[PDB]
Design a protein around this ligand. Structure first.
Ligand SMILES: CCCc1cc(=O)n2nc(NCc3cc(-c4ccncc4)ccc3Cl)nc2[nH]1
Ligand SMILES: [Zn+2]
Length: 348
């Protein structure tokens, strides 16, 4: 019941000071890397993007894995969609990145190739810390570093565009009944970001918007600022991420749930905030019912084989192109069992 979930949340708090130390280790390495990068002409205007709850730039993703985004101010960007994918684009210009231009197009692989070299150079140069360097399979996390042989950080290069959001997002960010039309208009005036994921295509990124709507998450502007308005939205997201983490830990050898990530969990959770816009639907005292709402919607997404991207609704995260049908059935079976029996996975 709800007291079992509160105990899970209390136990997760116990690792708060360990996560803070690990994040501080990441911050020191990133800040060193930021210094060098600003010496290269192509990356002269690089800075850290405000995406996480540690300082402002280190984003927790899993127990000992962090995410960091370097933003690059790039003006006069023109986008051309790569064939009805809605998510992927070529980058044009109507400048420092001239070396990576092939025709009128900006090569993500050439820009990404130099980025890696500089970081790989500077990782070796100064070692008052044990820092190594991996290449994760997908190029969306551009570089992965391993600090003290425990902490891993994904570093992502992103182009910053101050232009109006692409037309594929016109029907996304469906927050009007929850956070208001005024807030939706404000958010869409902010920049958007382009990260090199696979041709030489770029994918849109809204990491800065996720942080904003997580930390300013109520219908009431004073949600969670006083004892009378304590909701459980953040705790429900934490429990959902931890549920997936704990289930994945049971299949270390086979990696049966390898295709599922906290990105999927977060997407479903923000759809549930859309569906349940009132702060009274997230009363802290209703933790058990609210968590059930989140789990039940996730199950529905698994069974209908459909999880819409929060910003580009025509992009289905759960299409069989991306996640095998049998993988979705397997996770459906695991979660359905956990829900029907009060989440034994959380038992001590
Ligand atoms: C606030 C809700 C969660 C969220 C945060 C965020 O920063 N973003 N950024 C986009 N961009 C659009 C997009 C992203 C991905 C993706 C695939 C894999 N890892 C990352 C992103 C795949 C397809 C598409 Cl269309 N969506 C989101 N959702
Ligand atoms: Zn709140």
């Amino acid at each position: 019941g709800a007291s079992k979930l509160r105990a899970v949340l209390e136990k997760l708090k116990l690792s708060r000071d360990d996560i803070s130390t690990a994040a501080g280790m990441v911050k020191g390495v990133v800040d060193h890397l930021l210094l060098r990068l600003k010496c290269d002409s192509a990356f002269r205007g690089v800075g850290l993007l405000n995406t996480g709850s540690y300082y402002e730039h280190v984003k927790i993703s899993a127990p000992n894995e962090f995410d960091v985004m370097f933003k690059l101010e790039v003006p006069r960007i023109q986008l051309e969609e790569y064939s009805n994918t809605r998510a992927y684009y070529f980058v044009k210009f109507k400048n420092p990145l001239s070396q990576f231009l092939e025709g009128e197009i900006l090569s993500a692989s050439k820009m990404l190739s130099k980025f890696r070299k500089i970081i790989k150079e500077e990782i070796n140069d100064i070692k008052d810390t044990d820092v190594i360097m991996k290449r994760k399979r997908g190029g969306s996390p551009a570089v992965t570093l391993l600090i003290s042989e425990k902490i891993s950080v994904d570093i992502t290069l992103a182009l910053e565009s101050k232009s109006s959001w692409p037309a594929s997002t016109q029907e996304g960010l469906r927050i009007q009944n929850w956070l208001s039309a005024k807030v939706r208009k404000q958010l869409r005036l902010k920049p958007f970001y382009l990260v090199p994921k696979h041709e030489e295509t770029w994918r849109l990124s809204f990491s800065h918007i996720e942080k904003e709507i997580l930390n300013n998450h109520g219908k009431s502007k004073t949600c969670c600022e006083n004892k009378e308005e304590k909701c459980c939205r953040k705790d429900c997201l934490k429990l959902m991420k931890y549920l997936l983490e704990q289930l994945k830990e049971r299949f270390k050898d086979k990696k049966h749930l390898d295709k599922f990530s906290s990105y999927h969990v977060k997407t479903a959770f923000f759809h549930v905030c859309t569906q349940n816009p009132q702060d009274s639907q997230w009363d802290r005292k209703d933790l058990g019912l609210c968590f059930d709402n989140c789990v039940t919607y996730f199950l529905q997404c698994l069974r209908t084989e459909k999880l819409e991207n929060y910003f580009i609704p025509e992009f289905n995260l759960f299409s069989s192109n991306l996640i095998d049908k049998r993988s979705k059935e397997f996770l459906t079976k695991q979660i359905e069992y956990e829900r029907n029996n009060e989440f034994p996975v959380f038992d001590e």
